[PDB]
Amino acid sequence: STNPGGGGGGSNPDTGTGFPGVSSFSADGSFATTSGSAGLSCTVFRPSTLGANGLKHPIIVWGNGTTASPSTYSGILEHWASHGFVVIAANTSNAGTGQDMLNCVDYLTTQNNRSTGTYANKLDLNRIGAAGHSQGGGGTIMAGQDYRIKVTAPFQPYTIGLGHNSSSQSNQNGPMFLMTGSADTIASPTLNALPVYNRANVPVFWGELSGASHFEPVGSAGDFRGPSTAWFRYHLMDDASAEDTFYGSNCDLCTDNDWEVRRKGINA
């Protein structure tokens, strides 16, 4: 949380990659947003103007929970877009293999590399993260093996079925912000998340939110919204103010009794 600008009604300085600073990770940011279909089988939520002020936009690829669509998560996806991310959701309700998510990344790469178009030279292909809920959180871990996925944020992942291959957990490309809810009886954290924490080959920040059901991530994603935004702003925008959300002995979530935190490979 620590920011030299002091937040609030002040004006926090730009991030390391040049994106506007924000006074809150849970409130929407300064970019007006739009959404629409992308490549037939994806849906994008993005700033309505891309590439202003010399910026190249980081990307979050999203996988839905079982039975769900991108609209089920429109609040959280629009929220990230309002901070400056280009957010691409696989449309599928069956995101567990990770392949649809990676196809959405391939699609945006093509568009970035065109001479003209919505995305032409406007994306930062070195700053891609993955996130998703439920089976889509398992799919985030599956997709997170790919060398282009810099960090992941699985929201209540389901890893005991629905396309998951648990060996993916030990083949991640980058660090993981693993989120669970203590009231989640559908993707039991003991069965679905504890094994990921144990076997992951990367640093893991595992936060379990007290009193969160399996439906906390739907819509605007509740009390996961701010933390997930901090994670992606830190790693994909070099927002230094998000560092002490996760790192150090006195990190924000570490001293917040609403969270049970288990870390590995994270400076503490």
Author numbering: 20 to 287
What do the paper's sentences say?
Here, we report PET‐degrading α/β hydrolases, including HaloPETase1 from the marine Halopseudomonas lineage, thereby extending the narrow sequence space by novel features at the active site. The enzymatic degradation of polyethylene terephthalate (PET) offers a sustainable solution for PET recycling. HaloPETase1 is a salt‐tolerant enzyme and depends on higher salt concentrations for the degradation of PET at elevated temperatures. We propose an extension of this PETase classification system by type III PETases that include HaloPETase1, 2, 3, and 4, as well as PmC and dsPETase05.
The crystal structure of HaloPETase1 was determined to a resolution of 1.16 Å, revealing a unique active site architecture and a lack of the canonical π‐stacking clamp found in PETases so far. HaloPETase1 has the canonical α/β hydrolase fold illustrating highly conserved spatial positions for its catalytic residues S156, D206, and H236 as known for IsPETase (type IIb). There are two disulfide bonds observed: Db I (C64‐C126) and Db II (C273‐C276). While two bonds are characteristic for type II PETases, these are, however, located at different positions in HaloPETase1. Notably, we could not observe a disulfide bond flanking the active site, as it is known for IsPETase. In HaloPETase1, on the other hand, we observed the non‐conserved aromatic acid Y180 in subsite I (equivalent to W185 in IsPETase), which might form a π‐stacking interaction with the substrate.
